[PDB]
């Protein structure tokens, strides 16, 4: 019947570019729909030469076992018969795409990069230049059971990095290896025991596993989204993939302890389709490192609005966070304390057009504490941030010795509220979630508390990490309609 990997795929001018090995274009699963470009750039150089790309072309546009059944594909050869390539050879393939984008008429371009090497400055820069031209790049996280931030093109902020899950929605394990993880991963997708086109015969099928199969699955979903809505931007498409994903189905015990909070618990899906609603996502900064003046900075992607800023430290030695304007957008800046291991800056990135979010700061009062509110017309409070200079201590409230920061976004169509939940003797964490139909915009811990490690948003739940009642404070927004 229908293979397991297609269970979450609801069937209702888009070109999918493939940069892989050679492909067998004559395969019944993909023939007439997959074009072979004259591009070829492989290092150190028959049915085994075609095995990888043929499977992936079948995963994307396969007639029987494809995600986007009948999608138009154009393949480039950047990987040899042993599936090996070069960053240099990959750049030339990407330049070939940019040249092809200008010759051929306008339309959505999906570039599938089911390969990985170490972090490359030039390769990530090439992925940035294409994304600035309106290209949707879907990449594999890597099969090294490592942090995908150490791999290119997985580490490129402008691409969609895809991790691999098995039939039980668990991260793929292959010997001492398996799927990569971390904050550079956007979501996961079926990447183990994936049936697809075999290059052995024109109607043969083979089962393959890897982040390549998972990335090809996401490229399939993206092509179906762009067929229905060809004017979707990359920011809109990334938010929809996250919104459409299955939540909390992955047991995070598979990931190293320090990567569980960073790794998104999302498995790709395409649910049955359906006005304007609020979509938010969480971005994690790089670790600040040990320095009393060290700083972690989390920013949002182009076309996104930063609505809140929070911070986190595994030791708890921190000096909070603050929102500040850089360019025309707000940035999330976290502060480390003296003798602190370092902090993470956590941002809430939403699609709220022409919101023009501004930061409103009140200095420490040293009175009974500090307070600030959004007073502008058509403005809503989306986040509450607080930082302090001391080594030991619609309104935002903070500690009397700390500055308080309010994110005020111009959005007449939104209605926001605050949900709280306090626990006197907490068992490592305090949780509060927004109701159904509500989007979490801000997660913060209530001040005057004993010892809080930090606060971060997990979908529509405010999570406050603990060592008076420790209170988790959630700012929930939604459209009036």
């Amino acid at each position, epitope marked *: *019947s*229908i293979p397991w990997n297609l269970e979450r795929i609801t069937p209702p001018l888009v070109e999918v570019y493939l940069l892989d090995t050679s492909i067998q274009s004559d395969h019944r*699963e993909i023939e007439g729909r997959v074009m072979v470009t004259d591009f070829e750039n492989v290092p150190e150089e028959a049915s085994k030469c075609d095995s990888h790309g043929t499977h992936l072309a079948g995963v994307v546009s396969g007639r*029987d076992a494809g995600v986007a059944k009948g999608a138009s594909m154009r393949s480039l050869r950047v990987l040899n018969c042993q599936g090996k390539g070069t960053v240099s050879g990959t750049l030339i393939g990407l330049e070939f795409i940019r040249k092809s984008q200008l010759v051929q008429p306008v339309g959505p371009l999906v570039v599938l990069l089911p390969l990985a090497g170490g972090y490359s400055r030039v390769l990530n820069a090439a992925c940035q230049r294409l994304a600035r031209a309106g290209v949707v790049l879907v990449t594999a996280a890597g099969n090294f059971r490592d942090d995908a931030c150490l791999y290119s093109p997985a580490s490129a902020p402008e691409v969609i990095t895809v991790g691999a899950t098995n039939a039980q929605d668990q991260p793929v394990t292959l010997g001492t290896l398996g799927t990569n993880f971390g904050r550079c991963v956007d979501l996961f997708a079926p990447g183990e025991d994936i049936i697809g086109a075999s290059s*052995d*015969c024109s*109607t043969c*099928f083979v089962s393959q596993s890897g982040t390549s199969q998972a990335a090809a699955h996401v490229a399939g979903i993206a092509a179906m989204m762009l067929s229905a809505e060809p004017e979707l931007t990359l920011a809109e498409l990334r938010q929809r993939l996250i919104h459409f994903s299955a939540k909390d189905v992955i047991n995070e015990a598979w990931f190293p302890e320090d990567q569980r909070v960073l790794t998104p618990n999302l498995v790709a899906a395409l649910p049955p389709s359906t006005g304007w609603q609020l979509f938010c996502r969480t971005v994690w900064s790089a670790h600040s490192g040990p320095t009393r003046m060290a700083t972690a900075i989390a920013r949002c992607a182009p076309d996104e609005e930063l609505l809140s800023c929070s911070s986190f430290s595994r030791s708890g030695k921190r000096r909070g966070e603050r929102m500040e304007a850089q360019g025309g957008k707000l940035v999330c800046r976290a502060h480390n304390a003296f003798g602190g291991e370092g902090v993470y800056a956590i941002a809430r990135c939403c699609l709220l057009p022409q919101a023009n979010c501004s930061v409103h700061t009140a200095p420490p009062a040293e009175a009974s504490g500090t307070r600030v509110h959004c007073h502008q017309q058509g403005h809503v409070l989306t986040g509450c941030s607080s930082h302090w200079e001391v080594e030991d201590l619609n309104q935002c409230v903070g500690h009397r010795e700390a500055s308080i920061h309010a994110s005020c976004c111009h959005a007449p169509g939104l209605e926001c509220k605050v949900k709280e939940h306090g626990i006197p003797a907490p068992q490592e964490q305090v949780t509060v979630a927004c109701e159904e139909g509500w989007t979490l915009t801000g997660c913060s811990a209530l001040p005057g508390t004993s010892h809080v490690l930090g606060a971060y948003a997990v979908d529509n739940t405010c999570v406050v990490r603990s060592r008076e009642a420790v209170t988790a404070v959630a700012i929930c927004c939604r459209s009036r309609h």
Partner: antibody
Amino acid sequence: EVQLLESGGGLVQPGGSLRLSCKASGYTFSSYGMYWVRQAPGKGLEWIGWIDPGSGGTKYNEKFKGKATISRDNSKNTLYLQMNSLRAEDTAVYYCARERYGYYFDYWGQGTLVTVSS
Amino acid sequence: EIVLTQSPATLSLSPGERATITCRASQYVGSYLNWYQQKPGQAPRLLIYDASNRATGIPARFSGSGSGTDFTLTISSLEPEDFAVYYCQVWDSSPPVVFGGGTKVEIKR
């Protein structure tokens, strides 16, 4: 019209060899795959081998590995089969079938009976 | 290698009555399965190709269905000339072809 004319049926001595032909007409002979499939009476379809009239590329069933040989003559649009060291179990009706690459067997021969007896 | 398992070995039915033959593939073959009809003293004839498409010049009473591993061949109303031997066929890597064991459709009285 497409015709596949077989020839070379009859009696073969045990230890002897069968030599069959399949004359093709009505199409571009080199653009289609060709198989030799046999069938013992009452039993099912047993493939013997394959040939690509264009390249000359062959494939054989492992049971007939050393014993079977398939050749062709594109100028005559003719397919050939040779099966050495025959035994009484090799008594079957032999067919030549056209392969429409990746789809099906669209044309068959009439069926040629080969009987192994001394 | 792929193994095509046909069920039943022999089907005994009456003319006009409906006939269903099953072919089970040991692996995923998609929808690239073929059906053949073999009358005695004759070569097999292409009946259904790509698991659901009727071959040229074959009546509409023959219908095929299935995708993946389970495949079925349906004869709505049994004509007396429909009583023959049926084979399911698929392509593979090595060996390049796989035929089913066959199903003999027999007249019941």
